[PDB]
Design a protein around this ligand. Structure first.
Ligand SMILES: [Zn+2]
Lengths: 128, 171, 187
């Protein structure tokens, strides 16, 4: 009934906001900071640790400002919220690669313009 | 996909927890109950970002508990059919490959694995390799799999990974 | 009454029905309309047997019947059942039996897919492939069921599926000659 490729999601997943892995890591890191405070409180569950490692491993942006800049640029482009998370997560190198992964992305913009959008993410991306 | 949503939960507070810090106990009790529990409709819950509001605590007639409905914002991940998500291989076996995506665990059947891939029992670390060794998949590697289907049982969700589709596997 | 309709009615009746049905059709072929009583005397069949055959012929609407009520010479009421062949209704019903069989191929194929691929022979309980992983113990290294504490084998569930496939292509052979027969309906 729900397919990511077809951009079909249940009524619950309509107003939901998609957060990038780097953004997800920032919120989780804040939780860790709060975890240290108020000693003797409940220890964070292992599931929290699993996700924190996962988001950190795939973190495409290690700087808070870069994440905000990428989101601001993406906001100008008329892109679906779910597709924005995939675009900033997978970070396809070529426009054709992005189109193949997401069949719904075909026809949204021009192929030449699509490649330019991906190239911009690479410049903001930090390589270590 | 990671989603930040508002969830509705009901907390039954024992009368012993009444008095000062009642709301604090409700907030603290919410974290313990929600964390470590998963549901099919909303998927695994990692942590509660914040508590939107604590509703009126209706006293249960005869029972003595007070039912506190809580609106809280938490981030959850759910496997979507026909979606490609990066995965990490935990264990390698001839029958199938086990991969973990955060809290969610995905199992890859041998049939779904590409034909050219073959189990490597001779090697000390079990792994799947081709005749030409162009692509090698072993334990603790980042691979891409397609979620063929999702099944939920005993408040646990797991998906099926298939590498038949292009742009999949170790990159 | 074109000879094509007469020729086919014999061909179809002799194929999916016994000699009893074919013999009754021959009488209606020779004469457009024939009384039920007259057919009974000619065929010498039992009253119940003839009625059952006629009812079956009425079930597929190959031949229609009309009831005539009159007064006999002695004054007693006479109710004679006159049977006549309705080719226009016959063609539609016989044609319906084609598409159902033709579309029956898809329905039969779904039956094989219903059978589960994985099963547990010792406990005689079907095991879901996914549920096997949860039932599977990583320490043991092989899937097993706690209640019976024995290994599982899915090879047994494989053999029944293969046989059913032969039953399908074998099914199509039956309706192949009839396809030629029904071409006389359109002509
Ligand atoms: Zn068993």
């Amino acid at each position: 009934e729900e397919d990511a490729s077809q951009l079909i999601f249940p009524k619950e997943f309509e107003t939901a906001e998609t957060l990038l892995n780097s953004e997800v890591h920032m919120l989780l890191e804040h939780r860790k900071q709060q975890n240290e405070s108020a000693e003797d409180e409940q220890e964070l569950s292992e599931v929290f640790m699993k996700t924190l490692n996962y988001t950190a491993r795939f973190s495409r942006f290690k700087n808070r400002e870069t994440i905000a800049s990428v989101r601001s640029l993406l906001l100008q482009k008329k892109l679906h919220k779910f597709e924005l998370a995939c675009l900033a997560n997978l970070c396809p190198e070529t426009a054709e690669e992005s189109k193949a992964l997401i069949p719904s992305l075909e026809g949204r913009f021009e192929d030449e313009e699509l490649q330019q959008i991906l190239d911009d993410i690479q410049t903001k991306r930090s390589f270590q | 996909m990671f989603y930040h949503i508002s969830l509705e939960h009901e907390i039954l507070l024992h009368p012993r927890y009444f008095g000062p810090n009642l709301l604090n106990t409700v907030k603290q009790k919410l974290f313990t109950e929600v964390e470590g529990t998963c549901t099919g409709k909303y998927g695994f819950v990692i942590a509660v970002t914040t508590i939107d509001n604590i509703g009126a605590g209706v006293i249960q007639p005869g029972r003595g508990f007070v039912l506190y409905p809580v609106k809280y914002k938490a981030i959850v991940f759910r496997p979507f059919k026909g979606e490609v998500v990066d995965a990490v291989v935990t264990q390698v076996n001839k029958v199938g490959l086990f991969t973990e995506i955060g809290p969610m665990s995905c199992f890859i059947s041998r049939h779904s694995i590409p034909s050219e891939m073959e189990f490597d029992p001779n090697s000390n670390p079990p792994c799947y390799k081709t005749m030409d060794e162009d692509i090698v998949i072993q334990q603790d590697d980042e691979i891409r799999l397609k979620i063929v289907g999702t099944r939920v049982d005993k408040n646990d969700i797991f998906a099926i990974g298939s590498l038949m589709d292009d742009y999949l596997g170790l990159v | 009454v074109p000879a094509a309709l007469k020729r086919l009615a014999k061909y179809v009746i002799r194929g999916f029905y016994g000699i009893e049905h074919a013999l009754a059709l021959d009488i209606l072929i020779r004469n457009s309309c024939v009384k039920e009583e007259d057919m009974l005397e000619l065929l010498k069949f039992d009253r119940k047997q003839l009625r059952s055959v006629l009812n079956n012929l009425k079930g597929d609407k190959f031949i229609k019947c009309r009831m005539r009520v009159e007064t006999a010479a002695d004054g007693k009421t006479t109710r004679h059942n006159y049977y006549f062949i309705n080719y226009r209704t016959l063609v539609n019903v016989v044609k319906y039996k084609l598409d159902h069989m033709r579309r029956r191929i898809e329905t039969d194929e779904r039956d094989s897919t219903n059978r589960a691929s994985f099963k547990c022979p010792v406990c005689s309980s079907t095991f879901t492939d996914l549920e096997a992983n949860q039932l599977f113990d990583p320490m043991t290294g092989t899937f097993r069921c706690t209640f019976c504490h024995t290994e599982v084998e899915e090879d047994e569930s494989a053999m029944p599926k293969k046989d059913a496939r032969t039953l399908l292509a074998r099914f199509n052979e039956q309706i192949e000659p009839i396809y030629a027969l029904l071409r006389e309906t359109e002509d």
